[PDB]
Amino acid sequence: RRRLQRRIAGLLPPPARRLNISRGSEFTRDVRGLVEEHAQASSLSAAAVWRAGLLAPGEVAVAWSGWRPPVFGDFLIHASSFNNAEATGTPLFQFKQSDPFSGVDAVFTPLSLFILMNHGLTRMANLLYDSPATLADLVPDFGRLVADRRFHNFITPVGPLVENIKSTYLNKITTVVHGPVVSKAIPRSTVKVTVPQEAFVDLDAWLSQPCPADARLYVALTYEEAGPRFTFFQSSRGHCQIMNILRIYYSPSIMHRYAVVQPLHIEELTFGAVACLGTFSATDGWRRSAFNYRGSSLPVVEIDSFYSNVSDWEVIL
Amino acid sequence: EADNQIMGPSSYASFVVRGENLVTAVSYGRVMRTFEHFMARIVDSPEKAG
Amino acid sequence: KIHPGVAMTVVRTDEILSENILFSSRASTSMFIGTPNVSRREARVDAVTF
Amino acid sequence: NEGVENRPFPYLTVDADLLSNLRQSAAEGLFHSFDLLVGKDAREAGI
Amino acid sequence: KFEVLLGVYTNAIQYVRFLETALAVSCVNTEFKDLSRMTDGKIQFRISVPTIAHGDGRRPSKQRTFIVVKNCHKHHISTEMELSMLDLEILHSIPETPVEYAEYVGAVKTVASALQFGVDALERGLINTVLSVKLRHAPPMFILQTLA
Amino acid sequence: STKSDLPAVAAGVEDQPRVPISAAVIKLGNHAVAVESLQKMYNDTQSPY
């Protein structure tokens, strides 16, 4: 009954949320304990681990805040299939391979996906990948898998890259599949998801009341007449709205697909699919930039502060 | 009713590249105006606020 | 441009940006000044909203 | 336009406030070269 | 051949108060700690209305007494500064190299600037609140000219 | 009485010294009113006055 007191005194304390500040010039111990957050990294010493508290269970606590650590999904890829000059924050799209026991993976950035679709944006695609044939056999039968319009249920978005070690023959990437996208380096710095500007469109800008707490990034494969395209939507609504909103936005191209060809078949009838990619702050995100290569540059959409959270593929019609 | 004269500086100011600025100028070619205040501001007592 | 049988009367509204004076008397209100509270609100992925 | 180095310098405090019509100037481009840092990104960058 | 930088300048933020500005003549102020504890305030007046008796026969109004009560207007004011997690995890960490020490006093400078910015935003919000209290409790002059 | 209620209505307003603040004070007869401006305080923060 007193052992329970000493135990419940340790299991009691929630983090002190409010605090009576007196003067901002004071910077006393209470406000430092409010602003201090423990790191996921320290040097391998006894004092550094025992002060950073790396061995704490569940979270990192020196010796439940709305903060959870992320989860990494590491893939091993053919090093020719992934141009290593790409930045940290680019959304990768792992193709579910038809090989039964293959331990090698086939990820795609959307730039590498563009030369897969078609076979400035095209200039940076062909400068980043001089070879449209070593990716045309990663998918073994692209013409069949698109001509029966089942390409959307084979591509699993795995969120953005965070760290990529450049090995020579078989490349190892570390992505973030779910949660808060943040770097793991010895100086920690911010990671920003970069999507190409010509591919990225907006949805509040296309429509031109309330402000939400977060906006959700959407990816959208769609089967047109001239091949598939990977547009990237950003929306601040909910999903069940966005299905009807993109049905309105594609209601031109739905009539165009029924018009320029008549679907005598039955597997052609789907018109793309959309999958949520996660939430970011709806206020100051997607500040544009340009991704500078050795000789050229494409304009890029640099979404800061991503919470990666993949959803599944829902058809559009 | 205007006054006829104002006091003012007679000579131009003197910005001469001293030794450490010259070393930066020789190595990288980038000179800091008043490098001495950089040394007093981020080496000896950087915590003193502006 | 012939006149119909009706005659409309237009109503508009006009916005006039003034620069107002403001008087207030001595000791008009008594004010109960509280205390400042600081608190975080939403610890997102890289920034904690104080 | 994003031309600034954005490094943590030892900055100098001046006597004269410069704050008048500032966001209005940066909205229309009185300055050729500048960088706006809002909230989170207003930290000094790493060496 | 060198490119020179000629100086790195910044603005010194002026510190305002409420008792130092001249709007505080229009109000008296009380440091009341337990204002979240308070729910309602009340000033109750009693004003006896005297009268003069007449000579003629009218209905004589007797001695009257007006009692009015005046209630308090609570005001809440709040802005949101944001700090990056990176400066905070640098702040809890111990520096051992002078490079990390430079980054450490940089993050300390960032968080201290944020703290004085927070109290400065509450100080400006106080005077904004007082001005809105006055500008809601003020009719224009072309009503008080008739009611004078 | 009003002369006996004068410390009673003076709760915490009198046990205070008088420090000077700056104020542009004009005179309208017997009043000594103080015309001031605070658009300096609102032109820093880019808020409409």
* For E81, nearest residue in chain C (alpha carbons): C50
Resolution in Å equals 4.1
> Which chain D residues contact residue A304 at CB under 8 A?
40-41
* For E103, nearest residue in chain A (alpha carbons): A187
* For E20, nearest residue in chain F (alpha carbons): F21
CB contact under 8 Å between C40 and A190, yes or no, is no
C38 touches chain E (CB under 8 A): yes
| Of A182, F21, C38, nearest in space to E25 by CA | F21
CB contact under 8 Å between E85 and C41, yes or no, is no
> Which chain C residues contact residue E82 at CB under 8 A?
47-50
Is the four-CA dihedral A149, A153, A155, A160 of positive or negative sign? positive
D12 touches chain E (CB under 8 A): yes
Give the whole-angstrom CA distance, residue A128 versus residue E61.
98
CB E130 within 8 A of CB E27: yes
DSSP for chain E, written as a single string: --EEE---EEEPPPPP-SSSSGGGGSEEEEE-S-TTT----EEEEEEEE-----SS-------EEEEEEEE----------EEEHHHHHHHHSPP-SHHHHHHHHHHHHHHHHHHHHHHHHHHHHHHHHHHHHHHHS---HHHHTT--
Q: Pairing state of beta strands E9-11 and D12-14?
A: parallel
Q: What tokens does A154 get?
A: 């084979």
CB contact under 8 Å between A37 and C48, yes or no, is yes
Experimental method: cryo-EM
> Which chain D residues contact residue C47 at CB under 8 A?
39-40
CB contact under 8 Å between D2 and A187, yes or no, is no
- Mapped onto helix, strand or coil, the DSSP state of residue B30 is strand
Is the four-CA dihedral D36, D39, D40, D44 of positive or negative sign? positive
- Residue A277, number of CB atoms within 10 A of its CB: 27
The size of the C-D interface in CB pairs under 8 A is 3
> D41 to chain A, minimum CA–CA distance in Å?
10
CB contact under 8 Å between D39 and A305, yes or no, is no
Which residue, among E92, E113, E115, would best test binding to A if mutated, counting the most A CBs under 10 Å from its CB? E92
- Angle formed by the axes of helices A110-118 and A121-128, to 10°? 100
CB contact under 8 Å between E11 and D18, yes or no, is yes
CB contact under 8 Å between A284 and D2, yes or no, is no
- Angle formed by the axes of helices B35-42 and B19-27, to 10°? 100
Q: How many residues are listed for chain C in this entry?
A: 50
Three-state SS annotation for chain A: CCHHHHHHHHHCCCCCCCEECCCCCCCCHHHHHHHCCCCCCCCCCHHHHHHHCCCCCCCCCCCCCCCCCCEEEEEEEECCCCCCCCCCCCEEEEECCCCCCCCCECCCCHHHHHHHHHCCHHHHHHHHCCCCCCCCCCCCCHHHHHHCCCCCCCEEEEEEEEEEECCCCEEEEEEEEEEECCCCCCCCCCCEEEEECCCECCCHHHHCCCCCCEEEEEEEEEECCCCEEEEEEEECCCHHHHHHHHHHHHHHHHHHHHHHCCCCCCCCCCCCEEEEEEEEECCCCCEEEEEECCCCEEEEEEEECEEEECCCCEECC
CB contact under 8 Å between B47 and E7, yes or no, is no
Phi, psi of E33 (to 5 degrees): -70, -45
Query: Side chain identity at E97, as an amino acid letter?
Result: T
Distance of CA B47 to the CA centre of its chain: 21
When CB atoms are compared, the residue of F23, F34, F41 closest to E16 is F41
CB interface of E with A, residues 46-105, below 8 Å: 83-86, 88-89, 91-94
Token pair 């897969």 is found at A116
Give the whole-angstrom CA distance, residue A214 versus residue B39.
44
